[PDB]
Chains A and B, each alone.
Chain A
Amino acid sequence: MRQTFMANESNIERKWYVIDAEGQTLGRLSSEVASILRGKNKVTYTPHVDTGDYVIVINASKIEFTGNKETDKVYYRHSNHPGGIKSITAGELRRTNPERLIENSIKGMLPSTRLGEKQGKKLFVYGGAEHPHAAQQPENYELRG
């Protein structure tokens, strides 16, 4: 228990990025955003403290699936009432509410602790090429590869 830096509040500096989902694959974009979102690209990554940045997934209406996942790839839920499953296909949740589609994909790639879901609240997804956060000075981030 010697010299090892540990970041904390009053030591953290969070930023804002814009990211375009125009031409990207759904789950291959979702996984770089979850690493930006969780503070694992910064040298001062501390596990018990919220590092990480804010991300604005700008477009979100042009995200792409591959194969037959437009009519395959059904999403299920239960109302907690008897016989209460409900389902929607991946291509229909893009024609209807294409922001919930990207929000639920990235959130399944974060932990389910109190900190893990304080971090998915730094996620803002928009269908269409405009965001209302122009006052936060968002930069631009490119997906590797």
Chain B
Amino acid sequence: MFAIIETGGKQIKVEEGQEIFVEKLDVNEGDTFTFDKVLFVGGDSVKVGAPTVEGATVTATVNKQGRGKKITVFTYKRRKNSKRKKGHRQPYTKLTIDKINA
């Protein structure tokens, strides 16, 4: 019950039961996503994939594809009449780990 998957441009340490915030995936709500590149599988049978384990998988189910919290991006320089206000709100996909296939 200890895997290290590389989803997005990042890496997460998953555990069977846990929810995980990732980047925006190309799936609709309800279906299952399976990830192929896992780098490490802990527990009692450790498996250190060199770049990857080459035969392991993790399967999840997607929930609540949504946009992040709202963050204002403000900027100015002092004695010039010069400022810039933006708004941004980043998308995420919510997932739930189901089974860790080593």
* Residues of chain A at the chain B interface (Cβ within 8 Å): 2-3
Contacts and interface: CB of A to CB of B under 8 A. Distances in A.
- Chain B, interface residues (CB within 8 Å), range: under 10
A3 B13 CA distance: 8
B76 interface: no
A131 B13 CA distance: 47
Contacts of B13: 3
B74 interface: no
A3 B4 CA distance: 12
Contacts of A2: 12, 21
4 residue pairs, one from A and one from B, having the closest CB atoms: A3-B13, A2-B12, A2-B21, A3-B12
A43 B22 CA distance: 27
A1 to B, nearest CB: 9
B68 to A, nearest CB: 11
A2 B10 CA distance: 11
Contacts of B21: 2
A35 B12 CA distance: 31
B82 to A, nearest CB: 32
A136 to B, nearest CB: 37
B8 to A, nearest CB: 11
Interface in B4-23: 12-13, 21
B69 to A, nearest CB: 11
Nearest to B12: A2
Contacts of B12: 2-3
A46 B54 CA distance: 36
4 contacts: A2-B12, A2-B21, A3-B12, A3-B13
Contacts of A3: 12-13
A98 B12 CA distance: 53
